[PDB]
Amino acid sequence: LTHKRRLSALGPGGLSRERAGLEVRDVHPSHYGRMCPIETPEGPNIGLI
Amino acid sequence: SPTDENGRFTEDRVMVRKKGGEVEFVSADQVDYMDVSPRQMVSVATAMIPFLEHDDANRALMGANMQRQAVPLVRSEAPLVGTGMELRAAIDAGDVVVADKTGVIEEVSADYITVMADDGTRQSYRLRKFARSNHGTCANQRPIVDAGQRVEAGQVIADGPCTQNGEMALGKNLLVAIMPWEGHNYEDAIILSNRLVEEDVLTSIHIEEHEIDARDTKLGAEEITRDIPNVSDEVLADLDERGIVRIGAEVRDGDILVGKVTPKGETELTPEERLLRAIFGEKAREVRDTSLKVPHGESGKVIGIRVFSREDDDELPAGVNELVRVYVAQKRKISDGDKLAGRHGNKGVIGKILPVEDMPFLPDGTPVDIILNTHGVPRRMNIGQILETHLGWVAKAGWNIDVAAGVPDWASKLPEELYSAPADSTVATPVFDGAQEGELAGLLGSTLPNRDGEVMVDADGKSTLFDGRSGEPFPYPVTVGYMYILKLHHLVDDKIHARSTGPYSMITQQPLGGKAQFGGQRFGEMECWAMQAYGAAYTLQELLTIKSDDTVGRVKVYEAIVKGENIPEPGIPESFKVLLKELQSLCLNVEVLSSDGAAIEM
Amino acid sequence: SAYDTPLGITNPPIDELLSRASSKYALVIYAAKRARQINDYYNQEYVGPLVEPGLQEKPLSIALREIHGDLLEHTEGE
Amino acid sequence: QCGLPKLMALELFKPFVMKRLVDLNHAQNIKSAKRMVERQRPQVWDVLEEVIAEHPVLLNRAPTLHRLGIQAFEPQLVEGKAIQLHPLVCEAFNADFDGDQMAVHLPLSAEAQAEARILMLSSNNILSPASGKPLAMPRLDMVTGLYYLTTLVEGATGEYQAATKDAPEQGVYSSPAEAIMAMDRGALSVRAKIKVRLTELRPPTDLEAQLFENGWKPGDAWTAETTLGRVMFNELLPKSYPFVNEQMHKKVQARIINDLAERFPMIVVAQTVDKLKDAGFYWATRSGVTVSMADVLVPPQKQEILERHEAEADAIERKYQRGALNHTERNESLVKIWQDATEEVGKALEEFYPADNPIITIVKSGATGNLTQTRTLAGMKGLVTNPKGEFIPRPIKSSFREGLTVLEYFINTHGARKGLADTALRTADSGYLTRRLVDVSQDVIVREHDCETERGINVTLAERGPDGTLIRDAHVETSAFARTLATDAVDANGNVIIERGHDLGDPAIDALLAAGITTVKVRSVLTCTSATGVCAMCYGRSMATGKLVDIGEAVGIVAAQSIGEPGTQLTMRTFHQGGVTGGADIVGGLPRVQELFEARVPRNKAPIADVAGRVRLEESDKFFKITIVPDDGGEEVVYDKLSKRQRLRVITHEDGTEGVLSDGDHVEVGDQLMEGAADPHEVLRVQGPREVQIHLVKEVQEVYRAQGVSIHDKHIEVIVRQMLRRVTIIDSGSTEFLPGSLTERAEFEAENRRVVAEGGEPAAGRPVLMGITKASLATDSWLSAASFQETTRVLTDAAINCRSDKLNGLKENVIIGKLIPAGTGISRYRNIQVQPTEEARAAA
Amino acid sequence: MLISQRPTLSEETVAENRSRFVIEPLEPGFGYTLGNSLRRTLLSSIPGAAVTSIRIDGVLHEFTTVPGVKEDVTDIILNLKGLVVSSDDDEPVTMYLRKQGPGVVTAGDIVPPAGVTVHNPDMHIATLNDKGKLEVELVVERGRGYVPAVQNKASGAEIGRIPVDSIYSPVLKVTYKVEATRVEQRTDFDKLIIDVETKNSISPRDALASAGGTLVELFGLARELN
Amino acid sequence: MLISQRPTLSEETVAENRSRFVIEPLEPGFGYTLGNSLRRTLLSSIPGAAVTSIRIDGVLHEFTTVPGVKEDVTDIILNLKGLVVSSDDDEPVTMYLRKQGPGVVTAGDIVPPAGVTVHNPDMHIATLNDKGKLEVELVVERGRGYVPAVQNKASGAEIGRIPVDSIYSPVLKVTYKVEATRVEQRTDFDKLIIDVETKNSISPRDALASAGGTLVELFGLARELNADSEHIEI
Ligand SMILES: [Zn+2]
């Protein structure tokens, strides 16, 4: 159920493989009410997914 | 934000979010909008963690992600204390069968459910039994309706792989005592009662899918047969006529699953091999055994075989004739090293499973199921687990709030529906609007007595536990309750690994990597620095040469070990030999000298 | 000195062995050489064990007990 | 010991098991034994027990930051599949039992087994190599038990009380056995005060000097006023150890273990720590430490404090509205106010909690946690940071006991999300510096015992101060401790206390303080005159074992690892890509250490006095002007471009308290005029090689001390030595030294003294300070040089010279495949010849 | 003062399968240890009877379903694990449970051989619809404690045999309480009350007697000394 | 049901009155079942004689010190509590200790009544000073275990009758531990190590024999409820 509702920043036409710096993978205030700040994978995609 | 019956705010100042995302306090006449509910920010998984107020963001993240790694158990059980989301999330996932139209259950069976709709239409729902999921977990469904029962439209008629009565049941709720115990729960370890092993509380079914095929080769096509060469009847007793293991037979690592043979090339027997052919009357054949076998450290019972072949018009990869897939299922109990965790991010590994008589037990004789160390709760800032423990205890044993002299001051905010409840009465506590500290503290003192009429747990949530081994009562009361914990998919059965000798990579000559390839462990540069700091020259030398890309030395050491000879000394690797040869090729007269200015050696 | 009986590979005590060699590094090679001699003898000109061997003690343990017993001598290679 | 799974051990020892199976006739050939092992027949388990005995195995957990990351254990078979690890080594491995894995390696050769059994055994590595303090000591649960056992509480059952009419002393017991018997009946509490007759516990030294002037012996009975728990604890310690009689806070246990390390052999320390582990677990089980919300007390003064500070926050807001403040200034003022509020709330919470409450008992005993976590759990969360890293003016006034609101939780998630990336990025800089340090000092090995040098460095031990008691220097434990004296130490009467070459241990420092001598002269790696490597005597005590360093120690790599391991605790440059350059604000941490080790000109340079003399000081619109007139010299010196933004150096005498440097003051050569960092090159030019090395060591240790890291000065000295090993030639005389070339100082001096045919015609040259990078980028070995530089040039130059390479570079040996020239690999030990004695051989 | 008064034990019933035994008087501090020892012996080493394996006609392994049966084989086995039986002979015995047509199959439909008793016929085994035919053969043995399922290969049994976990334990829940006594004017001696509840196989008195016999045999080793 | 293997009891001597008994191999879990029971039986079952009260003639309320002797009243009480006394009376008995003149007074100077024996006459009691004397009377009676000094609050016939703690049990110290041992390919079997330190009046072997007899005696009560109920047999 949680896989079907993912929002992935990585992928073709998204952001470059080597440009996924710590700045993009952060909790912006606009996430409130439309993206959960707690749930995210523990892998290398922390914040990117 | 508090509001009146009409909806008007009852406070002069309200907390609001403004343009820059800044949170501030503004007058009641400046607000423009409000959130529909407190659960607006959280997601589906995060919405299923009770008392989410009291858990830090990091531990909430860990718990939310660990909920996604729970393995379905043989019998699911809904949590005593949970959230209202667990119902909806169960239905929206889709794994539960819901009756499309109102009607009567004409016939019910393990395999299918037949429903006769009120309008005369008939529906049939086939349940998927022991189906292997993408990750090896069992997706077994089971019906929850009786023949002749009436079902409304949208009602759940069959439980999913991991739900009870159509609501999420990712784990089991069991009795926990919060105390250190002889150091067996030291450093986040966990102690379990042997009951959980005897009653199959945490047992789970795991299914593995092995695969093989016969392909066309430059010497011809491979073949699947039962007549594989050079094997005793003790090995292939359980193979069918087609050469595939019979369904229902149990297999252990090394057992043959599918008998397969491949054509070989020129033989050119050695004189010894020719002598062996002569002394055993071995008639010439040109096939070699390549039969599929159970991988190292795997076992179970065969539950299904699926076979494809292009001769039956089935689509196959180019240059392939037949393909076989075998399903092996096993029933893994909980064992040492298996990873368990709660919903609040508290996780550990089972360091010890104690006999039932050794566990601390309540005054009425009930032994506790799990013991969690006290030192792990405070510093991790995940005290929500203690809230869950207390509320689970309150739920397991019913409660009754007295109203003889009016509702208690702490019960004013409680809805009337919570003024009483029987034993095993499940409760719901939403993430951001649930049981308060005062309400829970008041409820803890209103629990019903036990069978004998004596309350086990006092108003503080603590009980006087007895020592299972010594028999003396523990000097101080110990926090006791019911916690919902779940079995993660990090089982030790698929993490243990070992290697003495095995395959080697052709490109770089080093041992392969990974458990699947039967590879060796990495020895990085930092490990070399540590070994140098120890001054262990010989160990480092043998690690870098004998246990690494040195074929001659490797074979010599293996021979010495097997024959009992002392390990031969190493020296002069091939890389240095070729470097010296190149240096000579450059007309540089390189030579190696012994001692402080002595003659050459070899 | 007063100390409980050592267990396993802690017998003989490490300090007593360091008191009978130039340094721990020298002790390592000393014991390794004696163990190699014992193993070579068991494979059949070396003297063989000098102390009463246990049921299945490894050559290195025998070498270490012999060193502790002052039954061996060595010369620095420098 | 360690627990090894049966299935894993069988695979690891397969060939040995096959050999033993064939030997015992269970298998007729190697192939049959191989099949038996693969198929796991019943008999292989009987042979595995015989094979595994006394065969050590190495346990490792990557990453290996320090040498104790790999340790040898004696394996024993256990059921199941999870490895069993001794708790006391967890701190060494940085491992917790929440899902961590570990790797096991099997030594094969006899030399490898001996090395694992002797050098790498866990019981031999009690003390950490970075500072010599014990590492395998009680922790977490084990502390809480021992803290509970030795605690004294008034009013306990059966406690001691004095005599009274018709009643003698009421709480006196004739022996520990009687006290235990009384405790079993519930008449006496283990934590109650009693007077007990002890006969096998040595009395305290101060009490021993009185009660037994002839010296205490076993069996002598003395009456001790103590608690039964303390008597029980003191039985775990060695028999000869004096009775302690103190509450066992983690610091006290560390002190006791340190004292045991000095006075007793390592085996006794291992046994004592095992006994302490057992007792600590047993009494932590029964200490009653449990967590419930009834125990999470909230102070009753939180409300008053919060409104009191809310009033001031409202005052700040009112002033901002009136136009007296800017946005950033208002935010800073609010942050100040709320930090004060959090501080007072924390103090109130600390005061309120009872001494026996589990939540605060866990912290105060030092077993786990800190008071900040307790305040966050109960008092209030406090302030949180934006995604940019700046504090939000409005704090989280709620506590996790109460439960954060929606907005508070959302703003709190920012720091939690940031930390995940921050921790990952923190390791890169530490690894960079660690690799630099390892490269510069990999092959610094102890080559000889004594260099017979009289030179050294002076270290201060204490200040006799204004009172009648001298105060121990705070830096003594990392400056003078574990050194070797270069010259005799004499008391006020000239009586020698410690001989030259003795190790300055804790008893030695205590005795030195007893005589009141404040400073001593210690041999150092900096002043060691050994041509190659360093000598054992100058390095002195080995931190890991406490004994004089053995010939062949790999001191350089140990120092590099010790310096690099704590690099993650230092502050770093900001990880954000945007913003202005970060040099405006002094980030005095890892950047400062990197600047020092590279010998680069500081960005906050301050001048130093080239000549000792009196100072005439003038001021201008934007520049300072400082002139020094040498009192015993001639011409003055002038510095007339010092930026006025930089403040003048403060001197601040004890009572004179000069404060900022004034005109007419006196400054000696090497003194610093302006606040900032002195240029290492200027220090070298003014004072010489000795003072620049002292300056570098002081500067590095200053940062490491300020950031809360403790490293012995000798580790830093090992690195600093490599930086100043070359001398640049300015003019050559009667020797073939080319001008402008860099030569090793040893070779330079050797050539100058070798020119003897006409006496000396010295070639002129002066020392040059190099960064660790450039110093590491040079070597005397051509086989090693061929891996860094143009291989063709190196090979041609070596060929024309016909010069041989002696295989001493360590980094060079690993190319050959020959064992490293350190530890057991040096020729001094590699060629040992072993022969049984004639008297021992006679038994044959 | 020394008292020659001897301890004594008296039992009192609470239900059919629950009893309470009072032992008094005991030396001070001696009650808890005795009660804990009795509890451990009762929970660990009381002989009983249990099922060892099952054979269902229409299945070859437990990961399957029987046509017309609501429960799958795993559910049937987990339900059977709750069956408590009493056996008279040490060697294994066989029992048969056969039914056809719709209805609920319970433990009362099992036909035991001579010397075997089923003590809970009301337990639910399965439920069959109109097309359901159920045939089960159960093996019963004597033993004590928990014995995990024996592999077919180890026992040499043919395919179709489904080994199951065996739990040889009649005891269900045991606890104890301690009080003071009015012994003469000493008034500090202990009184032990041990409460025992057992599964319906055997009465609490027999279980307590078995525990006492085990403990007597084990302490005979200490008594052996002169 | 027969046990897998009959456990054996070995003994080792650690001192003149100290022993260590090893019971092995035991069925898994029975080590803890046996250890605590044996310890408590040893420390609370064997009867013995002890001093329960002492009256000194030279002091009424100045308990701090007694003239003519350097030992405090507390030291006198402790030394007398260290006395090892045995009797076959089963009733309180009065013992008189009187000495005069400077010198060491020991337990050997005592004059026990008929049927009372002092096992450690060499124990030091006090050191008498010049012009000094000592005169005390001890009440000795039998009992079990350790009884805290009974307070004679109602004593009217005497005020100087000091009550003291009574160590009746001949066994002074007992400590048990449980370890794991391996038989066949199973390592769940237990080993019980029990260390016993006793007075001079009884050897540890006799104390252990009496404890075993008492425990068999006590569990006979439970066994006799139904003697034919099947137990694990050895
Ligand atoms: Zn030197």
Author numbering:
A (entry chain C): 440 to 488
B (entry chain C): 537 to 1138
C (entry chain E): 24 to 67, 74 to 107
D (entry chain D): 440 to 1283
E (entry chain A): 1 to 226
F (entry chain B): 1 to 234
Which sentences did the original study use to describe this structure?
Mycobacterial HelD is a transcription factor that recycles stalled RNAP by dissociating it from nucleic acids and, if present, from the antibiotic rifampicin. We show that HelD from Mycobacterium smegmatis forms a complex with RNAP associated with the primary sigma factor σA and transcription factor RbpA but not CarD. HelD associates with RNAP by penetrating the primary channel with its β′-clamp opening domain (CO-domain) and the secondary channel with its N-terminal (N-term) domain. Indeed, HelD was shown to remove stalled RNAPs from DNA, thereby recycling RNAP and the template for subsequent rounds of transcription.
The first class (hereafter us-fork–HelD–RPc-II), at an overall resolution 3.45 Å, visualized complete HelD bound to RNAP together with σAN-helix, σA2-4, both RbpA N- and C-terminal domains and the full us-fork promoter. According to the HelD configuration in the primary channel, the us-fork–HelD–RPc-II resembles the HelD–holo-II complex where both the HelD CO-domain and PCh-loop occupy the primary channel. However, in us-fork–HelD–RPc-II, the presence of the HelD CO-domain keeps the β′-clamp swung out and the primary channel widely open. As a consequence, a large gap opens between the β-lobe/protrusion and β′-clamp and the linker between σA3 and σA4 becomes disordered. Concomitantly, the σAN-helix, which binds along the β-lobe in the us-fork promoter σA–RNAP primary channel closed complex, is wrapped around the HelD CO-domain in us-fork–HelD–RPc-II. In us-fork–HelD–RPc-II, σAN-helix, wrapped around the HelD–CO domain, would also direct the σA N-terminal domain outside the primary channel, which is occupied by the HelD–CO domain itself. However, the σA N-terminal domain would be close to dwDNA where promoter nucleation occurs, and also close to β′-NCD. The us-fork–HelD–RPc structures show that HelD can dislodge rifampicin and DNA/RNA hybrid from the stalled early initiation RNAP complex while σA and RbpA remain on RNAP and keep contact with the DNA promoter outside RNAP. This process would correspond to backward transition from stalled early initiation transcription complex to us-fork–HelD–RPc-II (gray dashed line arrow toward Fig. 6b).
